[PDB]
Paper text:
Within the elongasome, the SEDS (shape, elongation, division, and sporulation) protein RodA catalyzes PG transglycosylation in concert with the PG cross-linking activity of PBP2, a class B penicillin-binding protein (bPBP). Here, we show that PBP2, which is the major enzyme responsible for bacterial cell shape and a target for the diazabicyclooctane (DBO) class of β-lactamase inhibitors, holds a noteworthy zinc-binding site in the transpeptidase domain. We found that Zn coordination is critical for the stability of PBP2 and for proper cell wall shape maintenance. The structure of PBP2 retains the typical bimodular fold of class bPBPs consisting of an elongated N-terminal module known as the pedestal domain and a C-terminal module bearing the TPase active site.
Residue numbers in the entry: 62 to 222, 239 to 543, 557 to 615
Write the structure that this text describes.
Amino acid sequence: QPLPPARGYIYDRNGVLLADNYPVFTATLSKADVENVDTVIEQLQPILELTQEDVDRFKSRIKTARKTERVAIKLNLTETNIAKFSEVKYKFPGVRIETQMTRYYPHGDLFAHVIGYVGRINDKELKSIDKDLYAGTNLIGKIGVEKSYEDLLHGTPGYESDPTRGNDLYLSLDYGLQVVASQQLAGRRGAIVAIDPRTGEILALVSSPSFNPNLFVTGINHKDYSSLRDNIDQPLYNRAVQGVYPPGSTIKPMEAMGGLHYGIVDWATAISDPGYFHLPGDSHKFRDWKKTGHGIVNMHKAIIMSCDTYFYILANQMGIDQMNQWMRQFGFGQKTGVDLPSESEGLYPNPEWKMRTRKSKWMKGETISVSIGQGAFTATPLQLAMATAITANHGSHVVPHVLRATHGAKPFTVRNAPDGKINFNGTDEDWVKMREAMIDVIQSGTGRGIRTPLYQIAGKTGTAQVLSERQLDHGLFVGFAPADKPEIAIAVIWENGRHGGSAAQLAKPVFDYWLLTRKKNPIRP
Ligand SMILES: [Zn+2]
C-alpha cells in the first residue's frame, strides 16, 4: 500500500503563504478492488461528467500501476458529481470517493509568473518518472518554482500493511514589494525585476499581464486556456524570464566601465560631438539621438545626457570581441542561471554568432548598433537587473535566484552570496564615480521626475523600437538604492511606454516600498 507524500508549502521571505494544499473529493479505483476495469470507466463516464482527456489518463496510469495503488478517475469532484455517483454508489464496489489534497495559490495572479502551477501527470511525464516515487501522486509541477523545485517540493512516499512531506520553500520574493510592482504594471504590458545586489536574491518578479494559475491545477477547460493563449496581450508569456528587449541606453553605464577597464577612456577623456559618427570610408552616418550633439562630451556627460556619439567612438576602439568579453561579465548574452525554468539566453551579438546564424562576416557597422543597446542586442529584464546589481556592488557577480530557504527533511544547498569578482583594471573609485554619474541621471539628467527627498537613487533610462499603441517604443529603466549602500536594484520594461523617464516613474514606488514603507506599515494579505 503506497501513501503518497503531502506537497511542501511555498512561503515568502516573511512567511506569507503563497502555495498550500486543501482537501477535495476524488473518485479512485484500485486494481485489487476492481475486475474488468475497462468496462467500469465507460459506465462512470456520464455519472462523473468525465471528458476523453480524464478517461485516457486513468487507463495510462492503471496499466503502469500496482494493486494497492489508488488511481484517480476524476479529481476535485463537483457537488453534482458526488450526488450522481452517490445515487449509484453500491452499483460500483471498490470505486471509492476519497479525501485527497489539491494545490491552491492564495494570491494566484500576483506570483503566477514565479511559482507557476502544478497540473495532472500526463503520459510523457509518466515515461520519465520513478513510478515507485510518484505512486499515487496525481499532481506534478508544470512551470515556475513548482517545476524547477518539483523534487524538493514532492516529498517521499511511505506505506501501511510512513510518508515524508515535501520540503517547504521560503522564496526571496517579498509579498508587499510584489504587490507594489504589480500595481505599477496594472493594465500595462511589461516586466519589473528587483534583486538584492548583495546576494542575487530576487525580491520581486512581475510579468504583466498575469493569469490565475488555479485554473491549471485540476485541468483547464479548452475554452479558458484558448482565451489566455489567443489573447493579444499574451498573459501566459513570462516577459521577466523568457521575454527579451533591446536594452537601449540602459547598458551604457556598464559599457563605460568597460572603457575604463581596457584603458581606452578615463573620466576626463572628452570627444567633439557633431551629433553623428562615421566609420573610416563608410558613408552611413550613425546619428546621435540629438543630431546637434552634446558638444565636448566626457564619460560623466555621456551618462547624464545618454550621448550615443561617445559610445559609438568608444565601441569602435574597443571592438566587438572586447565588448563581448566585458559585457558578458554583467550577465548579458547567456542565461543568468535563475532557479526558474525556460530562462532566455538573450543575445550579445558576436562574429561566431553571425557566421552560424547569417553565414556572413561581421561588419564594423554592427558594432556601432550594439554600443547603444540596439542591433541584435536583446536582454531579459532578469539580465538587466543582474547587470545593475553588479554595477551597484562594484563588480561582485551574483546569480539571480528566488529560493531563500528550504525547511524539511531533504538535504539542499541554497546559494546566499556572490559567486565571484570581475578582475577590473580600474579602481573601486571608478564604480563610485559611475554611481555619482547615475545619481546625476536622476538629479539633473534623462531620468528627472522620479527624485526622492529621503534616499538617493542611481539610475539610467533607455527606449527600444518594436495598434497605434502596440507599435510605440518601449520605456526601460535600471537603477539601485540607497545608492551608497545598495539594498535593491530594479529593471523596468514598460512595453509601449514611449520614454524611459516613464519606466522610471514605475520604479519609485517599488524603491519607496522597500526602503521607507516595509519597516513601519508592511503590506500583508
Ligand atoms: Zn551626443
